[PDB]
Amino acid sequence: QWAREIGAQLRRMADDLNAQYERR
Amino acid sequence: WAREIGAQLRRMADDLNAQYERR
Amino acid sequence: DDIDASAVMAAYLAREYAEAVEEQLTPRERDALEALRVSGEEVRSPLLQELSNAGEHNSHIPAALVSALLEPTSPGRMVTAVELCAQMGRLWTRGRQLVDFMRLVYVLLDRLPPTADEDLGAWLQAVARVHG
Amino acid sequence: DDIDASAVMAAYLAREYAEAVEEQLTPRERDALEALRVSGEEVRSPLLQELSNAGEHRANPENSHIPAALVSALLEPTSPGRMVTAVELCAQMGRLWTRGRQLVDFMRLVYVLLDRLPPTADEDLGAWLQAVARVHG
C-alpha cells in the first residue's frame, strides 16, 4: 500500500515544515 | 423574466458572432 | 482580525491552476485564449447590463442561461456563455459559493457542441487578426 | 490546426476567478496568501520528490482516489504544516489535470480539502502564516 507509505512521508515533511515556523 | 434576459443574451451573442464571421 | 482560510486557499489554487493550463497550451491555443479574453470583454459590457436589471438574489438561474445559449449554437453564443460564468465567479468569492462556481463551469464545458474546437478555432482566429 | 476549446476556456475562467477572489481579499488575507505561496513553494520540493519516487502512475494518477486519500489523512488532529502540504498537493494534482475530464477530477479534490478542514483553521493558519511573513518579509 503506497497509500500508507506516501502519506507517512507527507506527514513527515509536513511536520518538519510546521516546526520551521512554530517558533518564528 | 428569465427568458427576457435569456432572449437578450442570445441577442448579444449573435451581434458578437456577426462581427468576426465576416472576417 | 480573522482570515477566511478557505478563500485564501481558493485564490491560491485558482491562480496555480490557471498558470498550469496556460503553460501547457499550444502556441495557437495561447493566441486563442487572448482572442477569447478580448471577445469576452467585448460582450461583458451589455452582459453586465442585463444582470443589473435582474436585481435578483442560488446557482439555478445561471445554469439554465448557459445551457440555453448552447442548445445549434455559435461561437458568439459560446463566448457569451463563457463570460457569464466568469461574472458569476466574480460574485461567488467566498464559502460554498466557490463550489457553486465549479458546478456552473462543469455545466458549461459539459454541454459544448462536438464541433466547438474548430468552430472557435476559426472564429477566434478572426478576432485576433483584427486586434493584432 | 484545431484547438482544445475546453482547455482554453478553463484557462480564461480560472485566471478570471483567481483575480476575483484576490480583489475581494482583505489586506490581512492578502498577506496570508503571500505567505501560503511561499511555504507552499518550500514544501513543494520534498513533496514532488516523494510523488515521483513513487512512480509515474503515482506522480500522474488517472484517478482521484489516491490524492484525495492523502489530503484527508493530512487533515485528520491537524497542524498548519499539514494543511499547507495538503493545499500544495491539490495544486500539484491540478497542474497535472489540465485537459478535459481531468478538470472534473480536480473539482473533487478541492472539495475534499475545503470540507475536511478543521474548525480552528481560520485561527491557527492566521497565526502560523504570520511567522512565515516576517521570516521572509
Residue numbers in the entry:
A (entry chain U): 132 to 155
B (entry chain C): 133 to 155
C (entry chain B): 5 to 61, 67 to 80, 82 to 142
D (entry chain A): 5 to 80, 82 to 142
Sentences from the paper on this structure:
Orf virus, a member of the parapoxviridae, encodes for the Bcl-2 homolog ORFV125, a potent inhibitor of Bcl-2-mediated apoptosis in the host. ORFV125 acts by directly engaging host proapoptotic Bcl-2 proteins including Bak and Bax as well as the BH3-only proteins Hrk and Puma. An Arg located in the structurally equivalent BH1 region of ORFV125 forms an ionic interaction with the conserved Asp in the BH3 motif in a manner that mimics the canonical ionic interaction seen in host Bcl-2:BH3 motif complexes.
For ORFV125:Puma BH3 complex a clear and continuous electron density map was observed for ORFV125 residues 5–61 and 65–133, and Puma BH3 motif residues 132–155, with the remainder of the residues presumed to be disordered. Puma BH3 is bound to ORFV125 via the canonical hydrophobic ligand binding groove that is formed by helices α2–α5. The four canonical BH3 motif defining residues from Puma, I137, L141 and M144 and L148, engage four hydrophobic pockets of the canonical ORFV125 ligand binding groove. Furthermore, Puma Y152 occupies a fifth hydrophobic pocket in ORFV125, which is formed by residues A39, V42, W133 and V137. In ORFV125:Puma this interaction is formed between R87ORFV125 and D146Puma. An additional ionic interaction was observed between E80ORFV125 and R142Puma, and this interaction is supplemented by hydrogen bonds between E54ORFV125 and Q140Puma as well as between G86ORFV125 and N149Puma. A comparison of ORFV125:Puma BH3 complex with TANV16L: Puma BH3 reveals that the mode of interaction is nearly identical, despite the ORFV125:Puma interaction being approximately four-fold lower in affinity. In contrast to Q140PUMA, R142PUMA formed an additional ionic interaction with E80ORFV125 that is not seen in TANV16L:Puma BH3 complex.
